[PDB]
Amino acid sequence: MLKPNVAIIVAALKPALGIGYKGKMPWRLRKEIRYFKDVTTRTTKPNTRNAVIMGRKTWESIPQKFRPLPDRLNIILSRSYENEIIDDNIIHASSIESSLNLVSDVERVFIIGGAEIYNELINNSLVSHLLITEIEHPSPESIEMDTFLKFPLESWTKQPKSELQKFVGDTVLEDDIKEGDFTYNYTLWTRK
Ligand SMILES: NC(=O)C1=CN([C@@H]2O[C@H](COP(=O)(O)OP(=O)(O)OC[C@H]3O[C@@H](n4cnc5c(N)ncnc54)[C@H](OP(=O)(O)O)[C@@H]3O)[C@@H](O)[C@H]2O)C=CC1
Ligand SMILES: Cc1ccc(Sc2cccc3nc(N)nc(N)c23)cc1
């Protein structure tokens, strides 16, 4: 597939934009996971699917029985991999662009993590949209975190919820979702 628009999808804790701790997410937000699954899976065209791209360490973090993520083409990057189609659901590649050359009948492409992937791919011009779930907590400093987004947000524009709605189509978008002490909202950002 030639030069598709790519989107990054991540959940981060404000104000620092922390996303992890010792290889895991520092929260369990059940509704947020459901939103991730829906946005990443749904398509509008007929015989198409979406593709999700992740770094080797994230792939490895999914229990073997639960990979590949169902109903989406999974792409796994590692600097040690050859560009290769494993099966109809799994591709190995050493670069985002090389992976995309092996795909057909894909509607949208999403980068799902982790931190190294995010922090490196944010500067790739193929990335056109960011879906950030912005998480808030009364005492963000009490949450232990070792991993953060280093995104140049001064070069991006947060769109109105109308644009996000249009992006996700049918998916229901609630406002100020609360789970335990966390409060969160979904946002869409595009480049200036
Ligand atoms: N909050 C959220 O929404 C999410 C958070 N996360 C969090 O992120 C953390 C994991 O991140 P991290 O450890 O950095 O792991 P990644 O999933 O980012 O894996 C990094 C690995 O990917 C490969 N890789 C990295 N960059 C490139 C590149 N530019 N080209 C090709 N291959 C590349 C390398 O494979 P090799 O070394 O084999 O070359 C590298 O070791 C955890 O804390 C996790 O919870 C993950 C997803 C979502
Ligand atoms: C192990 C593993 C860790 C993270 C992921 S990606 C992911 C998982 C759960 C919720 C997620 N929410 C958003 N908004 N973005 C992601 N990229 C998510 C996939 C596998």
Curated annotation (Swiss-Prot):
Residue intervals of the DHFR domain: 5-191
Keyword Translocase assigned: no
Binding site for NADP(+): 11, 18-24, 56-58, 78-80, 113-120
GO molecular function, one term: dihydrofolate reductase activity
EC number: 1.5.1.3
Record-stated family: Belongs to the dihydrofolate reductase family.
Name under which the protein is recorded: Dihydrofolate reductase
Species the sequence originates in: Candida albicans
Encoding gene (name): DFR1
